Design an enzyme around this catalytic site. Structure first.
Site: not given
Ligand code: NAD
Ligand code: NAD
Ligand code: DEI
Ligand code: DEI
Ligand code: MG
Ligand code: MG
Lengths: 345, 345
Positions: A185, A245, A139, A241, A217
Site C-alpha cells: 500500500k 484466500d 500480526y 492473508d 486494492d
C-alpha cells in the site's frame, strides 16, 4: 530425499498415503533418495503421547530435509487446553522451523474452468502463486493493546524480513513464468514505500525475472477480473492473508489446493484443507491437494522442477478422466490416485 | 432540497447534467424543494480562480444540504503543485466536511449478469453496500516512519470513530434488507477485537437489523463465491479500501458505480469514475453512476428511500432497454437518460 511424513488426522493419512504412492512410483521409475518415516502428529500424537508435537516427531522434522504434512484436528480434541490442541501443534511445528514464506498456488487446470466462480474466459489459464510473509507485520508488531476508549496495533517490517520473503518469490518465479508482482500500500503507508523500495532492490539480483508493483486494492480487483495474467505474487503478512484466500477460491474446489512453508528450517508441504472429520474413512477425499503438495515438495525443497511438472500434468489429466466427487465425479481416493499413476507411468 | 452541484471536468458535467434531468423530472412530478446551484470545482475552478476548491464553492457546499459531485482532474492540470491539483480539491472538500463514512454499492441488475466477471448464477441478485470508515485506522495512525533498517505504521481506532461509522451502516441497513456484516481481523489483532465488541454494542440499538461478524480474508472469499447473500458490509479504513474495490468489479462495468460520503458536514454523492478525458465531449459516457448518486442522495441525505428505489428501478429498466456502449449497446448519454425518464414518468 529424506522426508518426515506427518499424516495426522481425519483424511490426513488417506490423502498423505495417496501422495506417497505417487512419490514411491516416482522413486522406482526415476531413482531418487526417497527415504521417509511416518511420525505421529496432531490428534494421532495426542492419543498416544498426551501432546500433539512429540519429540520423536520433533526429532524427525529437524533431521528430515522436508516435511510432508497431512492435516490435524477434530471434535475429539476441540475441548482441550490451548497449549495442547492439534492446532497449536501446527503452530509449534511452523515456529520450530522459522518458516517465513507461505506459498499457495491457485490453478485452474485446462477443462476445469466450469468449476471456477469466475466465467470460463476469465478462469482459463489461471495459474498464480501467492507468496505470503509469515513471521512479520501487524500480526506481530509491538506496541499493541486495547484500552477502554481505543486500541492499537503496529505494522512493522524490517529490511531483512522483506528481503528473505522477496528472495523466495524470485526463486519461485525463475522456476515458473519469470514474472513477479509485489503488493503493498505504498502510496499511503511508509511500511508500503519501504516494502516496495526493498523488493525493487532484491529484484536487481534476478535479471531473468520481471517485477511489477501493485496496490493491495488494485490487486484484489485484478485477481477477479484477470487473474490469468499473473505468475508469482508476493506480499506482506496480512495482505497475503487476504490475497491468497482470495486467489484460492478461484479454482473453485478446496480439494485442489496445495501449500508450502519455507524458511530456515525444514520446509513443510501440506494441503490447505483440514482433516475433514465428516468424510474421514469414507475413501472419498480428493487427494489432489496432497499430491500437489508432494509436487511442491519436489520443486521447492529439492529443486526437482521437471518431476514436479510431471506430477502436475498427471494430476491435471486425472482430474479430467476420473474427476473426484468434489469436482462433480465419482472417483474415490484410491481410484483417482490410480489415474494419477497411469499418467506418471 | 438545497443541492450544491459540482460538475467538475471531463465527463463530469455531462453525467452530472443527466442526474439533474432526473432530479428535475422528479421535482416537477413529486414536488420536492429542489433548489440547486452549479459551482465550479476541480479543473474548471483552476481555469477561472487559480485554485480547485474556491470559497464561493466552499460557501455553497457548507450552506447546501447535499453535494452532487461529478468528477475532476485531467492532463491539462497533472503537472501542477500538489497543493493545487484537482485531486487535492477532492481531498479538501471531503476533509472540509469530516466525512467518515464511505458508501459504495455494487449491484448486478436483473439481466446484467452477463457483465459480471462472476458466473451468471453467482452474480444473480448481488446487491451489497460497502461502508468504509474514512478518517481513522492505519492510514492515519501515529507513530509512523521509515528508518533505513525498518518501517512502522500504527493501526489505531478509538471507540467514537468505530461507533459513528457503525451507526451509518445500521441506518443504511434499515433502509435496505436489514442485515449487516462487520468485517475485522479480530482473531489476531486487538484493534480487531475492539472493532467487533464495539460494533456488537451499537447493533443493540437497532433491534430490526441483524449483525454478523467476519474476517477480512473470509469476507474476500465470500464476495467472490457468494456475494448475493450480503446486504450491508461495514469495516475499517484499509479493509474497506480493499473490499469495496473487490465488490466493485462485481457488476462488471465502471459506469454503473455510485458513491456517497457521509459525516458531520454536507454529504457528498459522486460517481466512482473519474473525469474520463479520452471520451469527454463525445456524448457517450454512461450516466448510470451519476444518476445512481442522485438516487443515493435522495436516500441517504434526504431519507427519501422510495424515490431512490424508483430511480434505481428506472435505471435498471433503461439498462436493459437501451444499454450504453460500456454495457455493449449504443445508447449515448442523452438517449439513455431519456430512457430513464420514460420509466420515471
Ligand atoms: O471441517 P474442517 O475445517 O476441519 O476441515 P476442512 O476445512 O478441510 O473441510 C471443509 C469441508 O470440505 C470438505 N473437504 C475438505 N477437504 C477435502 C478433500 N480433500 N476432498 C473432499 N472434500 C474435502 C470436508 O468434508 C468439509 O465438509
Ligand atoms: O482515466 P481516469 O482514471 O482519469 O478516469 P476513469 O477512471 O473514470 O476512466 C477510466 C476508463 O473508463 C472509461 N470511463 C470512465 N467512466 C465512464 C462512464 N461513466 N461511461 C463510460 N466510460 C467511462 C474512461 O473513458 C477511461 O477509459
Ligand atoms: C499460517 S499458514 C496456514 C496454512 O499453511 C494453511 O492453512 O494451510
Ligand atoms: C477516499 S474516497 C474515494 C471515493 O469516494 C471515490 O473514488 O469515488
Ligand atoms: Mg528482477
Ligand atoms: Mg443489531
Amino acid at each position: 530425499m529424506k522426508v518426515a511424513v506427518l499424516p495426522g488426522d481425519g483424511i490426513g493419512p488417506e490423502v498423505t498415503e495417496a501422495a506417497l504412492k505417487v512419490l514411491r512410483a516416482l522413486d522406482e521409475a526415476e531413482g531418487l533418495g526417497l527415504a521417509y518415516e511416518v511420525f505421529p502428529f496432531g490428534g494421532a500424537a495426542i492419543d498416544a503421547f498426551g501432546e500433539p508435537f512429540p519429540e520423536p516427531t520433533r526429532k524427525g522434522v529437524e533431521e528430515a530435509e522436508a516435511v510432508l504434512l497431512g492435516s490435524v484436528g477434530g471434535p475429539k480434541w476441540d475441548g482441550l487446553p490451548r497449549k495442547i490442541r492439534p492446532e497449536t501443534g501446527l503452530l509449534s511445528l511452523r515456529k520450530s522451523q522459522d518458516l517465513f514464506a507461505n506459498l499457495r498456488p491457485a490453478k485452474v487446470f485446462p477443462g476445469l474452468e466450469r468449476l471456477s466462480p469466475l466465467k470460463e474466459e476469465i478462469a482459463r489459464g489461471v495459474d498464480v502463486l501467492i507468496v505470503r510473509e509469515l513471521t512479520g507485520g501487524i500480526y506481530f508488531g509491538e506496541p499493541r493493546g486495547m484500552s477502554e476508549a481505543e486500541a492499537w496495533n503496529t505494522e512493522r517490517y524490517s529490511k531483512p524480513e522483506v528481503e528473505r520473503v522477496a528472495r523466495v518469490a524470485f526463486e519461485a518465479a525463475r522456476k515458473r513464468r519469470k514474472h513477479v508482482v509485489s503488493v503493498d500500500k505504498a502510496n499511503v503507508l511508509e511500511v508500503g514505500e519501504f516494502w516496495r523500495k526493498t523488493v525493487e532492490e532484491v529484484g536487481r539480483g534476478y535479471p531473468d525475472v520481471a517485477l511489477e508493483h501493485q496496490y493491495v486494492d488494485a490487486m484484489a480487483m485484478h485477481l477477479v477480473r484477470s487473474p490469468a495474467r499473473f505468475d508469482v505474487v508476493v506480499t506482506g503478512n496480512i495482505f497475503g492473508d487476504i490475497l491468497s484466500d482470495l486467489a484460492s477460491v478461484l479454482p473453485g474446489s478446496l480439494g485442489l489446493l496445495p501449500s508450502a512453508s519455507l524458511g530456515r528450517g525444514t520446509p513443510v508441504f501440506e494441503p490447505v484443507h483440514g482433516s475433514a472429520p465428516d468424510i474421514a474413512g469414507k475413501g472419498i477425499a480428493n487427494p489432489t491437494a496432497a499430491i500437489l503438495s508432494a509436487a511442491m515438495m519436489l520443486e521447492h525443497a529439492f529443486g526437482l522442477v521437471e518431476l514436479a511438472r510431471k506430477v502436475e500434468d498427471a494430476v491435471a489429466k486425472a482430474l479430467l478422466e476420473t474427476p473426484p466427487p468434489d469436482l462433480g465425479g465419482s472417483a474415490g481416493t484410491e481410484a483417482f490416485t490410480a489415474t494419477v499413476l497411469r499418467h506418471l507411468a
